Amino acid sequence: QWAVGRRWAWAALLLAVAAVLTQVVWLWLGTQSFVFQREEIAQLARQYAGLDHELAFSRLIVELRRLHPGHVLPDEELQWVFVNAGGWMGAMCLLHASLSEYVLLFGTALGSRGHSGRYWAEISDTIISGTFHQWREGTTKSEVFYPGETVVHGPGEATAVEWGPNTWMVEYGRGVIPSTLAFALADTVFSTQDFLTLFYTLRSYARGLRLELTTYLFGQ
Amino acid sequence: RWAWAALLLAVAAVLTQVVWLWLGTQSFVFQREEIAQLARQYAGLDHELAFSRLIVELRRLHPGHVLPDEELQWVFVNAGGWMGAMCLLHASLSEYVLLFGTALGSRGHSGRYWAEISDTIISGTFHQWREGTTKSEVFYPGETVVHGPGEATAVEWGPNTWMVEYGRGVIPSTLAFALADTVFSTQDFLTLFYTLRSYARGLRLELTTYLF
Amino acid sequence: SMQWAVGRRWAWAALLLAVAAVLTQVVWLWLGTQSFVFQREEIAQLARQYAGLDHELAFSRLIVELRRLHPGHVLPDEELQWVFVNAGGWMGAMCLLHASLSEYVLLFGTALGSRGHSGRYWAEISDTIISGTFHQWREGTTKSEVFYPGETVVHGPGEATAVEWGPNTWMVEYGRGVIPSTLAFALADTVFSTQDFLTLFYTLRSYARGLRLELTTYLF
Ligand SMILES: CC(C)=CCN1CC[C@]2(C)c3cc(O)ccc3C[C@H]1[C@H]2C
Numbered sequence: 001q002w003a004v005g006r007r008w009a010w011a012a013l014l015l016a017v018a019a020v021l022t023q024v025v026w027l028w029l030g031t032q033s034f035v036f037q038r039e040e041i042a043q044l045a046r047q048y049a050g051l052d053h054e055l056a057f058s059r060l061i062v063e064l065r066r067l068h069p070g071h072v073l074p075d076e077e078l079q080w081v082f083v084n085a086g087g088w089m090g091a092m093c094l095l096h097a098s099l100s101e102y103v104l105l106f107g108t109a110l111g112s113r114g115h116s117g118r119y120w121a122e123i124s125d126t127i128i129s130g131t132f133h134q135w136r137e138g139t140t141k142s143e144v145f146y147p148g149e150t151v152v153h154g155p156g157e158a159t160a161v162e163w164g165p166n167t168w169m170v171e172y173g174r175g176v177i178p179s180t181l182a183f184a185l186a187d188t189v190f191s192t193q194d195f196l197t198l199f200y201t202l203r204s205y206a207r208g209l210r211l212e213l214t215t216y217l218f219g220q
Numbered sequence: 221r222w223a224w225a226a227l228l229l230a231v232a233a234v235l236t237q238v239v240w241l242w243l244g245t246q247s248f249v250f251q252r253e254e255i256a257q258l259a260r261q262y263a264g265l266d267h268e269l270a271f272s273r274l275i276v277e278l279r280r281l282h283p284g285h286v287l288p289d290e291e292l293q294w295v296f297v298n299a300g301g302w303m304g305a306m307c308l309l310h311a312s313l314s315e316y317v318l319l320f321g322t323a324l325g326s327r328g329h330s331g332r333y334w335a336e337i338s339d340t341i342i343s344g345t346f347h348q349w350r351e352g353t354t355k356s357e358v359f360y361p362g363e364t365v366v367h368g369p370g371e372a373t374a375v376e377w378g379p380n381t382w383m384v385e386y387g388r389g390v391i392p393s394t395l396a397f398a399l400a401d402t403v404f405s406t407q408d409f410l411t412l413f414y415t416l417r418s419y420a421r422g423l424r425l426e427l428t429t430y431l432f
Numbered sequence: 433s434m435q436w437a438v439g440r441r442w443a444w445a446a447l448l449l450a451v452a453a454v455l456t457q458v459v460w461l462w463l464g465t466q467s468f469v470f471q472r473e474e475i476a477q478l479a480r481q482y483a484g485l486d487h488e489l490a491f492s493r494l495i496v497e498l499r500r501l502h503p504g505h506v507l508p509d510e511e512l513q514w515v516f517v518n519a520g521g522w523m524g525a526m527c528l529l530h531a532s533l534s535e536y537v538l539l540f541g542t543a544l545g546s547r548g549h550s551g552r553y554w555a556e557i558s559d560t561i562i563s564g565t566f567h568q569w570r571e572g573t574t575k576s577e578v579f580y581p582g583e584t585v586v587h588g589p590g591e592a593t594a595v596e597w598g599p600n601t602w603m604v605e606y607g608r609g610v611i612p613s614t615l616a617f618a619l620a621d622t623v624f625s626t627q628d629f630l631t632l633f634y635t636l637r638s639y640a641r642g643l644r645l646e647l648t649t650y651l652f
Pocket residue numbers: 083084085092104106116123153161171173180183184185201
């Protein structure tokens with residue numbers, strides 16, 4: 001037998017860790033189990049667009065609790081919380097939250113303009129009421145969306161968003177949600193100082209994570 | 221020399237007792253409905269003429285508690301995403317009075333400070349969207365809107381909106397929300413200095429009035 | 433005799449002092465021939481000729497004419513990129529056509545409109561409107577001015593205004609002064625609001641391209 005040098009063992013362990021971590025991340029990605037399909041949320045919320053946004057939200061929540069038992073928060077853990085980011089302000093009520101998927105009801109009663117953000121997640125907004133103006137990166141034109149339509153904010157893409165008065169939509173997102181949470185709390189920390197809103201957002205996220213962990217370990 | 225270390229605690233307890241008693245024995249210069257009616261009177265006038273008449277009547281009703289014309293100054297306010305301007309008439313650790321507004325209009329956060337705010341509208345519109353609600357409320361010239369302590373709303377001021385404002389609470393707590401966007405969005409340190417100087421002038425006026 | 437003869441070391445030190453004085457005097461003349469590539473309000477007098485048309489054709493023809501007029505000082509079509517611009521609570525987009533330490537030229541605007549704070553930098557900014565509206569609110573007043581297609585907004589050095597842009601606003605912009613002071617404020621929201629570091633990279637790279645073009649033109 002023979003020995004191996006220290007700097008040689010450095011590169012050897014580097015290669016070993018590289019192989020192990022790459023194959024482990026691949027085995028991780030291969031076992032990803034998305035609960036909601038890429039277009040299920042939109043194809044369901046379109047069936048309620050045009051109603052009273054309160055009635056539409058209630059019916060959508062009942063339908064999502066019926067179709068996916070164990071992945072929608074209870075009536076007690078539903079709470080509207082403000083959200084300030086990229087210069088815009090709205091309100092959200094979270095229904096489903098995990099490390100890859102999230103579902104919520106987003107909206108604003110006054111309207112707002114701002115920067116959508118650049119993060120690693122594909123997000124779908126199905127308009128229940130109001131208008132949605134979108135300005136894509138590198139254009140001089142604005143695209144308007146009305147109730148029924150669905151806006152797909154793609155990963156990497158950066159758009160200027162504008163919601164009109166009484167705008168209300170159903171949002172579903174899939175990707176690296178922790179990467180969204182950095183942009184999520186920027187205006188809360190450096191503008192509004194509304195730390196109770198920060199706590200409410202983090203508590204809703206923790207409640208969604210706990211519900212998903214419970215349904216994973218025991219479920220049904 | 222241990223007693224020398226404990227004597228500071230003794231004197232500090234005595235000083236805190238004095239401060240507590242003085243905070244208990246504290247009267248307020250202005251009342252809510254006073255400012256409300258005074259502002260609703262001048263609602264139908266031009267906003268500049270209304271401001272002038274209101275400053276005149278406030279100096280009449282409360283001398284020594286309103287700033288002089290040499291220390292009156294319009295200063296911008298960038299906070300919670302919204303932008304406006306204000307002119308501070310009176311300021312203390314407990315109360316403040318100022319004319320506020322915006323000529324272009326704005327939308328943004330309301331703030332979560334330890335103070336009750338009262339905005340009486342001279343011109344324009346005030347849209348308020350309360351926390352946990354899905355509808356909005358509107359206030360037209362002459363009406364008064366109260367922003368409670370520890371409450372967060374969404375505010376929207378239309379074009380050419382101007383109002384009178386009177387707040388009562390722990391005013392130093394409202395200062396953290398006051399300089400957030402000034403440092404992290406506009407970097408307008410001249411306006412920051414102007415705001416701090418207006419607050420210092422109000423404190424100086426109140427001190428020299430209470431002391432002579 | 434000895435009357436006209438001069439020593440050598442004295443002459444050496446005298447020439448050193450003379451060169452020192454001459455250089456310290458001609459360093460002042462660095463402000464004597466400013467030679468601004470654009471004669472005061474030339475950009476406004478130019479852009480007022482193409483403002484009536486659609487904004488894209490106007491932009492194209494303006495870039496063509498400006499490359500004709502001052503060649504070598506305008507970026508080529510390979511380095512013309514629209515970049516989002518968030519600052520002072522407002523959002524728009526820019527396309528840089530000229531960049532230097534004393535002056536800059538670009539095309540600015542937004543499709544959705546935006547309101548916010550102008551900024552307190554050492555610069556005289558000239559925003560010449562091509563399409564849309566401009567609303568300016570000067571400091572100390574309670575009224576506002578409005579500017580329509582064909583006019584020019586002059587943002588003075590050290591001033592501070594409230595800026596508003598309506599829907600489909602597009603203008604050209606030319607500014608003199610210490611541009612790094614403007615750049616310090618230009619990317620504050622990008623750090624503390626949008627957190628779009630890719631846009632920060634794009635804007636800094638565009639400024640670097642402008643500086644490189646202006647450097648390799650004075651040396652060639
Ligand atoms: C405007 C678009 C495209 C999506 C809005 N949406 C709203 C909810 C969401 C969870 C969020 C939460 C925050 O606390 C701050 C910002 C944002 C932006 C995203 C989500 C990542």
